[PDB]
mmCIF file of C-alpha atoms in Angstrom:
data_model
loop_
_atom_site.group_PDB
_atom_site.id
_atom_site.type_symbol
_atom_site.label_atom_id
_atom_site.label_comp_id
_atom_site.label_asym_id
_atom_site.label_seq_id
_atom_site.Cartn_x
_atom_site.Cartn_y
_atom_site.Cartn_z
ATOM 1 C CA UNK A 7 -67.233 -61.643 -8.353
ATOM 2 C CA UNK A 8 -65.016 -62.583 -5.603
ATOM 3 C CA UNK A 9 -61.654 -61.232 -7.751
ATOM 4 C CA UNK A 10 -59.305 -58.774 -5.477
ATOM 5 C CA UNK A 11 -58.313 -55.838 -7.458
ATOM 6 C CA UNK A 12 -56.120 -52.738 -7.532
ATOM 7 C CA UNK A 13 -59.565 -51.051 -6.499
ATOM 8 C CA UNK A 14 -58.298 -52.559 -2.913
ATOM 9 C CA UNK A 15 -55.629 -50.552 -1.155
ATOM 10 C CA UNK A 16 -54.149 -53.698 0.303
ATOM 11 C CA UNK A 17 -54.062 -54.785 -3.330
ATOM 12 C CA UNK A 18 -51.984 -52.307 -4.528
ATOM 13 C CA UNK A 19 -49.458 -52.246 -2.271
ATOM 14 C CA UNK A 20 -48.741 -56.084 -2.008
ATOM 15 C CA UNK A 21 -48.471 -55.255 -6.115
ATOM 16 C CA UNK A 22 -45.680 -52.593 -5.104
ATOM 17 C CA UNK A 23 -43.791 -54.539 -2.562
ATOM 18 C CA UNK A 24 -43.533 -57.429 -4.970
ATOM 19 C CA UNK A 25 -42.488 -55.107 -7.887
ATOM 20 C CA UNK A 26 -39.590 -53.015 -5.281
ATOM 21 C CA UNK A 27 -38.272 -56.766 -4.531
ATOM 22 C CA UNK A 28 -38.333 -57.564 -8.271
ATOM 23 C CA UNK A 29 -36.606 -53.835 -9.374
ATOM 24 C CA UNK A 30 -33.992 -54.629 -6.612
ATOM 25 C CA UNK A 31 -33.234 -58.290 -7.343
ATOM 26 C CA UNK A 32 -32.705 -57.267 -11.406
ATOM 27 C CA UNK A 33 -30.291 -54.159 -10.466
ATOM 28 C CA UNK A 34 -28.299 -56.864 -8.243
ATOM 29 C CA UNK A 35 -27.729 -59.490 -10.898
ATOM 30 C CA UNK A 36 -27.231 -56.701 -13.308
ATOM 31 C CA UNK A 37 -24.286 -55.375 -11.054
ATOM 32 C CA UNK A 38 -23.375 -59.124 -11.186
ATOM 33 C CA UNK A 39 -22.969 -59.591 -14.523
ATOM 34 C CA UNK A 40 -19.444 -59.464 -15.916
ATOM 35 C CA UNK A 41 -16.946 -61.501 -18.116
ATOM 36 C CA UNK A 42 -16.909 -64.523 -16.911
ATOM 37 C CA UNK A 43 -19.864 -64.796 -14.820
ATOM 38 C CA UNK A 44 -21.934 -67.941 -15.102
ATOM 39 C CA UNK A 45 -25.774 -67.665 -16.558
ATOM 40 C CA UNK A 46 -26.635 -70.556 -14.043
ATOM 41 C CA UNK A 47 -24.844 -68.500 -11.146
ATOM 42 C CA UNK A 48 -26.608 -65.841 -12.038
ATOM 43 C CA UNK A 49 -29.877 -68.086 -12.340
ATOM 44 C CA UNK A 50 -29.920 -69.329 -8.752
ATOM 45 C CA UNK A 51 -28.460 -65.855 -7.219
ATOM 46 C CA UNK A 52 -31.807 -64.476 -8.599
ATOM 47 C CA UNK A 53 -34.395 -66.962 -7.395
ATOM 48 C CA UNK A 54 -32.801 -67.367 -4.306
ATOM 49 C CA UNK A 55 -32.747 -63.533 -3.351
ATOM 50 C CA UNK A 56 -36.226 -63.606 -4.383
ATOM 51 C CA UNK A 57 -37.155 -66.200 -2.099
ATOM 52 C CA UNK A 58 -35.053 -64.278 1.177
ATOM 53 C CA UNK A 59 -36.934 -60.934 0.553
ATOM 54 C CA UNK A 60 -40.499 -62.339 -0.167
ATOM 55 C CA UNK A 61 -39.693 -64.058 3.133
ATOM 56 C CA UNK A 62 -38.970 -61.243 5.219
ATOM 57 C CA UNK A 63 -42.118 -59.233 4.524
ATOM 58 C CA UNK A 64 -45.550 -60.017 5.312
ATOM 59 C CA UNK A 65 -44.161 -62.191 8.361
ATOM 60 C CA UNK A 66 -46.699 -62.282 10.764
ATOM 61 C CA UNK A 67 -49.069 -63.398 8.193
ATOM 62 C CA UNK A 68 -47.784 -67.308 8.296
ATOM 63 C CA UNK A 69 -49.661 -68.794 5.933
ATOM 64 C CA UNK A 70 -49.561 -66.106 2.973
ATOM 65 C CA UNK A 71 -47.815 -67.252 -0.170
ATOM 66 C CA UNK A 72 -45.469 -65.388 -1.898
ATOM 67 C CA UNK A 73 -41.903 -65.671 -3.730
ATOM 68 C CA UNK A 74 -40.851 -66.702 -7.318
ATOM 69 C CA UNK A 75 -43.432 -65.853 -9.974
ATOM 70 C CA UNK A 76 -40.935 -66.059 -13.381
ATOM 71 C CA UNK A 77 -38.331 -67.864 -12.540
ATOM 72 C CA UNK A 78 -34.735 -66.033 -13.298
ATOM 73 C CA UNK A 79 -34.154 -66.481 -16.616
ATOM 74 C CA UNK A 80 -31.133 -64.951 -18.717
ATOM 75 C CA UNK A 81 -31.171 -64.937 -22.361
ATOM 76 C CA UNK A 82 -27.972 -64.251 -24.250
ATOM 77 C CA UNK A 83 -27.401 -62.316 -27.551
ATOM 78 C CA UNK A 84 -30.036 -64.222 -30.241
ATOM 79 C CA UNK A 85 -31.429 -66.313 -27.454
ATOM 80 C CA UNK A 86 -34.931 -65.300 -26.880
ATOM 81 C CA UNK A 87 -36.306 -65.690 -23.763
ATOM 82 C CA UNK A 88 -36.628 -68.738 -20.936
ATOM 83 C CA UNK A 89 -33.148 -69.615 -20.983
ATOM 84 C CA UNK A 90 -33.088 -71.335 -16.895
ATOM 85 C CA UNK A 91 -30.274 -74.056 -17.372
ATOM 86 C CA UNK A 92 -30.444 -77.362 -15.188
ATOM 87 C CA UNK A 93 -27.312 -78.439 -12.774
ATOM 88 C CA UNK A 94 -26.684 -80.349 -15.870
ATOM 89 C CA UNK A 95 -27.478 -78.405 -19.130
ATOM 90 C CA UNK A 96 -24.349 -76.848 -20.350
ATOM 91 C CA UNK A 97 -23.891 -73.357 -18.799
ATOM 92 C CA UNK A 98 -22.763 -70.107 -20.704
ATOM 93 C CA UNK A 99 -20.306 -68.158 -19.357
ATOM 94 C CA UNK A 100 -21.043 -64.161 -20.114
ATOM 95 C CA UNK A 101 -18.241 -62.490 -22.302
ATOM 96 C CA UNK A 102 -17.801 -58.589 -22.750
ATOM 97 C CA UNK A 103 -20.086 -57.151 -25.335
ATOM 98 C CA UNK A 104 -22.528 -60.005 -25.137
ATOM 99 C CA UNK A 105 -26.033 -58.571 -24.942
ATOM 100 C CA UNK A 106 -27.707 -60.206 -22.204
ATOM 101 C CA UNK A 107 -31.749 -60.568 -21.136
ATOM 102 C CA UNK A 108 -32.388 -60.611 -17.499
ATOM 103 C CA UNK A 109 -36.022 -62.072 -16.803
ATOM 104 C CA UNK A 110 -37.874 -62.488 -14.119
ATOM 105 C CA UNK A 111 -41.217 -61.878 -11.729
ATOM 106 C CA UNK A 112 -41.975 -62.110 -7.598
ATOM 107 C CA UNK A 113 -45.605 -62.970 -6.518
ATOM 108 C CA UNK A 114 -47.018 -61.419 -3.144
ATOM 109 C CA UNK A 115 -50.244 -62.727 -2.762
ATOM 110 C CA UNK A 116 -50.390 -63.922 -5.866
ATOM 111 C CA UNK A 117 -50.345 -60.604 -7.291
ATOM 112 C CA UNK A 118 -47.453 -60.937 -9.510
ATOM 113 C CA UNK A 119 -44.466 -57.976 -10.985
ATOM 114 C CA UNK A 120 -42.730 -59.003 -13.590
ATOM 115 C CA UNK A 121 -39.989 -57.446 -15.183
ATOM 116 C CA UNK A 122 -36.990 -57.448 -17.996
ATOM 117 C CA UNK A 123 -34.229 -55.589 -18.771
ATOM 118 C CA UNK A 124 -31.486 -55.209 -21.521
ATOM 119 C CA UNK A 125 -27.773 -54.495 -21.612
ATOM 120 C CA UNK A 126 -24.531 -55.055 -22.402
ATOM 121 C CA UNK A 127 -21.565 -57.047 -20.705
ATOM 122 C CA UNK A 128 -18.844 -54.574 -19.244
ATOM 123 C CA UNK A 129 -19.093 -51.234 -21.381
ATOM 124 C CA UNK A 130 -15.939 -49.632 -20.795
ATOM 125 C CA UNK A 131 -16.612 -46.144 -19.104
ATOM 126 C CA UNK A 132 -16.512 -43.083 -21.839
ATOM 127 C CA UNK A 133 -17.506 -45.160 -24.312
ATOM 128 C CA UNK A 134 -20.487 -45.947 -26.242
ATOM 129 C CA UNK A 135 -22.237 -49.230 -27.601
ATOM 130 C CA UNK A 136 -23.542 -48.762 -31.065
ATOM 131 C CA UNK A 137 -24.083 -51.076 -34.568
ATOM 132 C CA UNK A 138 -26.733 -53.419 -34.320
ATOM 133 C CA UNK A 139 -26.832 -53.802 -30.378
ATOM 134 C CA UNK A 140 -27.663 -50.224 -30.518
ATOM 135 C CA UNK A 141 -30.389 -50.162 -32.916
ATOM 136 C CA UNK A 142 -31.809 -52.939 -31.188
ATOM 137 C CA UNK A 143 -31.595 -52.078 -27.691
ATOM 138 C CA UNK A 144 -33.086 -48.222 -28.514
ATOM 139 C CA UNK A 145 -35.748 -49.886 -30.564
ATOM 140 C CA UNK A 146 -37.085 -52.158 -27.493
ATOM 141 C CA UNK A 147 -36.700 -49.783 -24.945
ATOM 142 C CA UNK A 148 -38.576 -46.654 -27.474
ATOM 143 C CA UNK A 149 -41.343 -49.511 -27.914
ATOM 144 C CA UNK A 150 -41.462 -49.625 -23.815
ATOM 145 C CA UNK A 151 -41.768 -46.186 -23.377
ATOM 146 C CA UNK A 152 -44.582 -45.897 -26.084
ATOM 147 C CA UNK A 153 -46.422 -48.969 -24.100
ATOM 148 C CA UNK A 154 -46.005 -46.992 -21.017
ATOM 149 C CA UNK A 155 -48.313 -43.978 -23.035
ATOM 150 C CA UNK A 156 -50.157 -46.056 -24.833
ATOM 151 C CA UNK A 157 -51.600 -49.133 -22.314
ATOM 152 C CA UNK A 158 -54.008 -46.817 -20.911
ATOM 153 C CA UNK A 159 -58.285 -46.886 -20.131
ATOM 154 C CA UNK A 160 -59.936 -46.017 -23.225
ATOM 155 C CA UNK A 161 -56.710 -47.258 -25.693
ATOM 156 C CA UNK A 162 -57.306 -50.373 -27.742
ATOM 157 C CA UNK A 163 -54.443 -53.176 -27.541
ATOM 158 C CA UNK A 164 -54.089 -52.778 -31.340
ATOM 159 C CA UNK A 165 -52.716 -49.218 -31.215
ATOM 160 C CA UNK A 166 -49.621 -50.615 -29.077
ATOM 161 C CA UNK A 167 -49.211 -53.346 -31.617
ATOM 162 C CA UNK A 168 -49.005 -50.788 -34.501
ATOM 163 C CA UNK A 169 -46.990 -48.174 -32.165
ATOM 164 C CA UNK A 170 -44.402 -50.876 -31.762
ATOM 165 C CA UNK A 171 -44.063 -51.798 -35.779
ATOM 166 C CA UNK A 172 -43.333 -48.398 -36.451
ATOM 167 C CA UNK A 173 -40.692 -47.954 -34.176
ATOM 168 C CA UNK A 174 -39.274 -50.938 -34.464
ATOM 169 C CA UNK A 175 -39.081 -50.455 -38.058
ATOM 170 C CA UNK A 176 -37.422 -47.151 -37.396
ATOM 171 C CA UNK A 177 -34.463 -48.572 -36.257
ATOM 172 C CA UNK A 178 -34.311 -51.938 -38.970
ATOM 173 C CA UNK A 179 -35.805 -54.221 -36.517
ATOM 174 C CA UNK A 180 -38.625 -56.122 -35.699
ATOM 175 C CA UNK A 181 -40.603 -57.066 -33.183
ATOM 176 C CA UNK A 182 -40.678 -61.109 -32.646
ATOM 177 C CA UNK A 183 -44.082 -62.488 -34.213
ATOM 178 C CA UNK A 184 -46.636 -63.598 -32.060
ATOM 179 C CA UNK A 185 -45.244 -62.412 -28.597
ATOM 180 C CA UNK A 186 -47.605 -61.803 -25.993
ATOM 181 C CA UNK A 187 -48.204 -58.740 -23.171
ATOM 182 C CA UNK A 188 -51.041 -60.852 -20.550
ATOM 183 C CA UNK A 189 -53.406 -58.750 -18.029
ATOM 184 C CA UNK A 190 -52.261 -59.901 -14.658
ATOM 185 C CA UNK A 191 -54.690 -61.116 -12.099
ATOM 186 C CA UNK A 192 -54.542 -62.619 -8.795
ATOM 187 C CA UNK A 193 -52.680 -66.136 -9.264
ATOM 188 C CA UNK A 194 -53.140 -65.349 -13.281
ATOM 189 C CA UNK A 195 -49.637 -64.744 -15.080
ATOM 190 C CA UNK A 196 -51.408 -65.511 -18.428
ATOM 191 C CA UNK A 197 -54.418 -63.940 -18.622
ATOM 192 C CA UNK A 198 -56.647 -63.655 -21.840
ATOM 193 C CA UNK A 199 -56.543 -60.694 -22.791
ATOM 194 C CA UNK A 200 -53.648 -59.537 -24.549
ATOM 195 C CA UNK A 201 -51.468 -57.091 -26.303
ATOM 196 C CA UNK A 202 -49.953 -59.183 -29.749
ATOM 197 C CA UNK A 203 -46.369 -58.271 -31.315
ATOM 198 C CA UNK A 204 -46.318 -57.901 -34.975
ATOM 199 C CA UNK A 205 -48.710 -60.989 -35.731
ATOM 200 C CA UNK A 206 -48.669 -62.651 -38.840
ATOM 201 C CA UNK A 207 -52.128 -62.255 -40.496
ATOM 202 C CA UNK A 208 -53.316 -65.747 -39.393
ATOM 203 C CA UNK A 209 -52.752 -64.604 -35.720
ATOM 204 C CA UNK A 210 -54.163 -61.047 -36.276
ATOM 205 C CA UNK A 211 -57.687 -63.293 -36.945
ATOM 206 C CA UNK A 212 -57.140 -65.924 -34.028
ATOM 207 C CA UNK A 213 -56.174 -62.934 -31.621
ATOM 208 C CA UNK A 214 -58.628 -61.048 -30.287
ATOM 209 C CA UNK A 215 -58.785 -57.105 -30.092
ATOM 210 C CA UNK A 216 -59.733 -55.359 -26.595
ATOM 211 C CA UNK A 217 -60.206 -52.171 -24.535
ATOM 212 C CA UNK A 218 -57.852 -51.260 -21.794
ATOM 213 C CA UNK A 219 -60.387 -50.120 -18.502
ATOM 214 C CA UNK A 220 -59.422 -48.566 -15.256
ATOM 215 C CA UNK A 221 -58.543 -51.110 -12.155
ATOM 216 C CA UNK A 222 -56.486 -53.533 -15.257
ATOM 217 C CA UNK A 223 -52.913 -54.724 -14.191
ATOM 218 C CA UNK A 224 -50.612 -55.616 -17.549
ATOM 219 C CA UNK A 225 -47.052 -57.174 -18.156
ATOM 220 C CA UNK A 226 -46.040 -55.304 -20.717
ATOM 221 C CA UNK A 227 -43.568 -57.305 -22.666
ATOM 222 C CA UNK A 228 -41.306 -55.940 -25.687
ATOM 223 C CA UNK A 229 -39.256 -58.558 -27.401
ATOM 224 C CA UNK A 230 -37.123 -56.837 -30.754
ATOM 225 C CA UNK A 231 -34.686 -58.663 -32.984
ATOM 226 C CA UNK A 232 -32.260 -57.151 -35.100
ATOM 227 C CA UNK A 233 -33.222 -59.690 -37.790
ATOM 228 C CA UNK A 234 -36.280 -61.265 -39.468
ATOM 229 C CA UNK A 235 -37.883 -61.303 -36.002
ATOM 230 C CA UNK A 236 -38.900 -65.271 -36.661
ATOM 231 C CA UNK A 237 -38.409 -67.149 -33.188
ATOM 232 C CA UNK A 238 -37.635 -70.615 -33.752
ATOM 233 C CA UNK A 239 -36.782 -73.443 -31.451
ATOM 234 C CA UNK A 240 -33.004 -74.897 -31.871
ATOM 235 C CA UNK A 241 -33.237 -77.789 -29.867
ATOM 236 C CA UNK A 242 -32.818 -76.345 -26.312
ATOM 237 C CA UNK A 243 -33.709 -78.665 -23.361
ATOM 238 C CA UNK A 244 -37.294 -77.223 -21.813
ATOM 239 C CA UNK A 245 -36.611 -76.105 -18.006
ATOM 240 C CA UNK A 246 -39.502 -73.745 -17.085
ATOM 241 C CA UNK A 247 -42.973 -75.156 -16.912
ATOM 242 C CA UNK A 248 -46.484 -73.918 -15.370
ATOM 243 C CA UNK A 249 -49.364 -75.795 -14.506
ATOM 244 C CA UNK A 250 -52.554 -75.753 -16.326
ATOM 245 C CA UNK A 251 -55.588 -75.862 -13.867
ATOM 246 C CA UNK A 252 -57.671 -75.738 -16.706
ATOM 247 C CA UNK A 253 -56.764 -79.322 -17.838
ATOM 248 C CA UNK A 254 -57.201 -82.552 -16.086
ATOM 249 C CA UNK A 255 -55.488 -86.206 -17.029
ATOM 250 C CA UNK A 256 -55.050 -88.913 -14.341
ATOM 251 C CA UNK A 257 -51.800 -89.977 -14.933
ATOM 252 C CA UNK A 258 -50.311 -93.717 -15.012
ATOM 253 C CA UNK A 259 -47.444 -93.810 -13.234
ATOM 254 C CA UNK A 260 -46.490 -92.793 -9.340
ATOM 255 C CA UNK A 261 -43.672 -90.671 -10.361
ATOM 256 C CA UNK A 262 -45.648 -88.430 -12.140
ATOM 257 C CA UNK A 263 -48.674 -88.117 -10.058
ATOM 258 C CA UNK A 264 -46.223 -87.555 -7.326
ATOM 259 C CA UNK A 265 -44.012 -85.038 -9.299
ATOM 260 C CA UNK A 266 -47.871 -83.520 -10.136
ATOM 261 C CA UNK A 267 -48.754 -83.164 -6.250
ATOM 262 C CA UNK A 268 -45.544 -81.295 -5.312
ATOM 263 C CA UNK A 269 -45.986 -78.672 -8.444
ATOM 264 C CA UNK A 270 -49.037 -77.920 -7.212
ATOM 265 C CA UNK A 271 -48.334 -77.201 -3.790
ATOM 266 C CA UNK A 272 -45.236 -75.558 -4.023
ATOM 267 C CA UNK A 273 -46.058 -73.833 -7.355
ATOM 268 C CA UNK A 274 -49.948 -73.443 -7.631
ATOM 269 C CA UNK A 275 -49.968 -71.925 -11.259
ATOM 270 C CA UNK A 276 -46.693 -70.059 -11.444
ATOM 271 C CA UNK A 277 -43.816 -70.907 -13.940
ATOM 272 C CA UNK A 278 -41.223 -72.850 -12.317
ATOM 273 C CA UNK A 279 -37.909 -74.132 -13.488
ATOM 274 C CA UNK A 280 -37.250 -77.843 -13.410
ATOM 275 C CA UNK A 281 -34.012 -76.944 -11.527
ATOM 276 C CA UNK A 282 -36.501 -76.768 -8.417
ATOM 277 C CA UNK A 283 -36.292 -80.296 -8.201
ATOM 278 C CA UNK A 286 -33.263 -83.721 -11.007
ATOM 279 C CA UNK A 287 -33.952 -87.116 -12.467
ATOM 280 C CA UNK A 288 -37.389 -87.902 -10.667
ATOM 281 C CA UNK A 289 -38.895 -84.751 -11.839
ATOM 282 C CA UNK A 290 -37.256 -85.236 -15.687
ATOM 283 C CA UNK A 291 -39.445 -88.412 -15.920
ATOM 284 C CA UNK A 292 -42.492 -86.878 -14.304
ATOM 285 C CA UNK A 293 -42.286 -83.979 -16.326
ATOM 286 C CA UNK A 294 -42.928 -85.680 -19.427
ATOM 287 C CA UNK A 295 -46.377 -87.622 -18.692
ATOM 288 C CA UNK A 296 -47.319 -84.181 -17.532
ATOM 289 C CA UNK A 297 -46.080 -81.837 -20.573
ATOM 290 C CA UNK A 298 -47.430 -84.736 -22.654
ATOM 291 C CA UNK A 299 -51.134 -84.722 -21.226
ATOM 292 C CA UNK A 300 -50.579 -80.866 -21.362
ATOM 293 C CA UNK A 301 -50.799 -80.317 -17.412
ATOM 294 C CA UNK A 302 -48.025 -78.806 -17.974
ATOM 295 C CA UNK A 303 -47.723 -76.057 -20.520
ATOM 296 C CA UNK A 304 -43.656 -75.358 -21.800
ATOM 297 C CA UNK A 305 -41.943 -72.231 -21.769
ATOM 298 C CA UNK A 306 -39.310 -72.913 -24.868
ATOM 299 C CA UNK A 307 -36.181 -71.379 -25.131
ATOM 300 C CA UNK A 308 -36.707 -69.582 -28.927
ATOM 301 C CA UNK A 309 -34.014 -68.474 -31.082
ATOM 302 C CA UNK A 310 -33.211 -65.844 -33.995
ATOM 303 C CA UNK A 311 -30.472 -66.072 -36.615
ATOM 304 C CA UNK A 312 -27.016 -66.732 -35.400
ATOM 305 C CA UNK A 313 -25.359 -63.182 -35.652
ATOM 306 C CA UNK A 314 -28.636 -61.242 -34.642
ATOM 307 C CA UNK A 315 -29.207 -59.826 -31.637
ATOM 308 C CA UNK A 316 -32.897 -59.575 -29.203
ATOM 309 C CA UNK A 317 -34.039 -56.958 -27.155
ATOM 310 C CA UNK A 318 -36.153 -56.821 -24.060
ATOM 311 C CA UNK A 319 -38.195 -54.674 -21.660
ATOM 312 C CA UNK A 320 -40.964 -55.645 -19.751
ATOM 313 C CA UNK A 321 -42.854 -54.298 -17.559
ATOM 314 C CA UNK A 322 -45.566 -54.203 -15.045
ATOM 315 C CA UNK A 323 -48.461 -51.490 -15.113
ATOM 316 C CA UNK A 324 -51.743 -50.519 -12.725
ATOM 317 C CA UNK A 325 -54.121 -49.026 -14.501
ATOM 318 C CA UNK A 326 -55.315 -46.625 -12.007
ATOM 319 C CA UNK A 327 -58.028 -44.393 -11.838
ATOM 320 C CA UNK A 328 -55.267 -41.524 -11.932
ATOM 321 C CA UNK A 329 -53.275 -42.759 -14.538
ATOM 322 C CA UNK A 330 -50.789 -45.468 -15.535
ATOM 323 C CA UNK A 331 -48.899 -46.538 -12.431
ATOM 324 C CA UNK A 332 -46.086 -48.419 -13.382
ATOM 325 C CA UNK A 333 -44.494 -50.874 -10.381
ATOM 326 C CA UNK A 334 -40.984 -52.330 -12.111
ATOM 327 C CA UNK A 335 -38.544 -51.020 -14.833
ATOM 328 C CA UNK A 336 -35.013 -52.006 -15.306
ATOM 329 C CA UNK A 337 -32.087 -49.198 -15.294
ATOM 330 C CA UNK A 338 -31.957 -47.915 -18.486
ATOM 331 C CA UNK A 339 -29.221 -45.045 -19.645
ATOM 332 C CA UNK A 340 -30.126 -43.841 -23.003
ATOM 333 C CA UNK A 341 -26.631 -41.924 -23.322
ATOM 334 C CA UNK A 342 -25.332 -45.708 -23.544
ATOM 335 C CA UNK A 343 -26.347 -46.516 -26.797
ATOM 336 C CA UNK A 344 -25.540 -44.525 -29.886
ATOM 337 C CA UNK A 345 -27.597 -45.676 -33.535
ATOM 338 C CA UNK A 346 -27.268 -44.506 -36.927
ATOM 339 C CA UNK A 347 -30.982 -44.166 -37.193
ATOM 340 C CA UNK A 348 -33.954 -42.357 -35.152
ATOM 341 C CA UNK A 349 -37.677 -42.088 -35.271
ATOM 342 C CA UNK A 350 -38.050 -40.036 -38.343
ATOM 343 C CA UNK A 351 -42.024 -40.201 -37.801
ATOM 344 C CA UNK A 352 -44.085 -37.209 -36.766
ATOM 345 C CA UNK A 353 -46.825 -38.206 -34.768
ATOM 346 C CA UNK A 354 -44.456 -41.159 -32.980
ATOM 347 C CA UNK A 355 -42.231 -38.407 -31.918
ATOM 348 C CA UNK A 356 -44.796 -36.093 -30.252
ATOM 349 C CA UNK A 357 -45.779 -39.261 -28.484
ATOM 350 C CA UNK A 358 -42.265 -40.493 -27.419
ATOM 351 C CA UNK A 359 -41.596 -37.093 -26.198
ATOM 352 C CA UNK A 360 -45.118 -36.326 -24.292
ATOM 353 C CA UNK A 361 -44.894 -37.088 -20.840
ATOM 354 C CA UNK A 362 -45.734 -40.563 -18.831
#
């Protein structure tokens, strides 16, 4: 009863300042990214810009939270998602024609805009990507734009899921099993209900199928691989972590009821990267992971060779229609594939208007 929701004025604009910081921060380290650049550069360019522009609106309220809701992450070729390196991790070093993920969400409030975008490292001009990185990339962003018609009051979350198999398909991908699109809330990046990607038929019976209504918020998230669309861990060092309010452990040692306290004043429930602290919070980090007070946001893999797509989004359901509040810059004349949707009914959708 005492939720604030997008039925609040107030509400929807600290939604839309937080996703106009998050659209301008991506475009930035988009513009950033060349040969050569480095990820972790690019990592800490991201969070900090995030931090100076939460920080110059809302001023007079002093004691308002706001700033980094996903940290930056930046996730290379077959890399997933969540790649956030530590000081000490070893960096990557963007090359041209790498495909690169750019991740990341600003809180105002704690109502939280998250956003994703795809592309590729220093496309000549007058000249086209294609092959693989094509299909892929067309594939994600077509599944986007179908979300964008589809996650609507009165739609079922099913309908995307199916929506996004058939275009993915289209193009000889798939979308990553299991991957998950959470209603936002106040101070809620992972709420329960959820739109599923191309679940295995054990998670099509442990997930649970639901109603999009009027006043909703969602972070539409499309994740497609050019290959078997299996995500697998590959031994990547964890970095970004949230807290879990929902479970409770006293821990044994100082460090990590210390390293506990400062998460949850500085963090509250938001992901954070470890880089936001480095030793000290390594060791506290693992009573707390261990006792699950801290839930893990693994960097996954696909098959060396393959390539991952991403656009995410975030969507107010309003009582007008679909409002959506980030996007990344997308140029469709970029990207030239073999294939196309070849199916009727997905094509009078993909070319209805949003």
């Amino acid at each position: 009863q005492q939720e604030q929701t997008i039925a609040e004025d107030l509400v929807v604009t600290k939604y839309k300042m937080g996703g106009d910081i998050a659209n301008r921060v991506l475009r930035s380290l988009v513009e950033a990214s060349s040969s050569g650049v480095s990820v972790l550069s690019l990592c800490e360019k991201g969070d900090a810009m995030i931090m100076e522009e939460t920080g110059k609106i809302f001023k007079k309220e002093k004691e308002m939270k706001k700033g980094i809701a996903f940290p930056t992450s930046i996730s290379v070729n077959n890399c997933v998602c969540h790649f956030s390196p530590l000081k000490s991790d070893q960096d990557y070093i963007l090359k041209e024609g790498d495909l690169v993920k750019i991740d990341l969400g600003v809180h105002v409030d704690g109502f939280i805009a998250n956003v994703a975008h795809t592309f590729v490292v220093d496309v000549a001009q007058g000249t086209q990507v294609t092959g693989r990185k094509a299909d892929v990339i067309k594939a994600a962003h077509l599944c986007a734009e179908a979300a964008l018609r589809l996650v609507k009051p009165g739609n079922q979350n099913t309908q995307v899921t199916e929506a996004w198999n058939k275009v993915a398909h289209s193009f000889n991908c798939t979308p990553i099993e299991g991957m998950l699109s959470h209603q936002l809330k106040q101070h809620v990046i992972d709420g329960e209900k959820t739109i599923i990607q191309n679940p295995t038929d054990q998670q099509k019976k442990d997930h649970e199928k639901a109603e999009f209504e009027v006043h909703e918020v969602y972070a539409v998230d499309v994740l497609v691989s050019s290959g078997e669309g299996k995500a697998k861990d590959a031994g990547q060092r964890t970095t970004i972590y949230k807290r879990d309010p929902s479970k409770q452990y006293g821990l044994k040692m100082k460090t990590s009821r210390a390293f506990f306290s400062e998460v949850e004043r500085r963090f509250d429930a938001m992901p954070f990267t470890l880089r936001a602290f480095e030793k000290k919070a390594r060791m506290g980090v693992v009573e707390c992971a261990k006792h699950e007070l801290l839930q893990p946001f693994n960097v996954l893999y696909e098959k060396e060779g393959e390539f991952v797509a991403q656009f995410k989004f975030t969507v107010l359901l309003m009582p007008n229609g679909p409002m959506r509040i980030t996007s990344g810059p997308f140029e469709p004349d970029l990207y030239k594939s073999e294939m196309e949707v070849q199916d009727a009914e997905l094509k009078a959708l993909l070319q209805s208007s949003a």
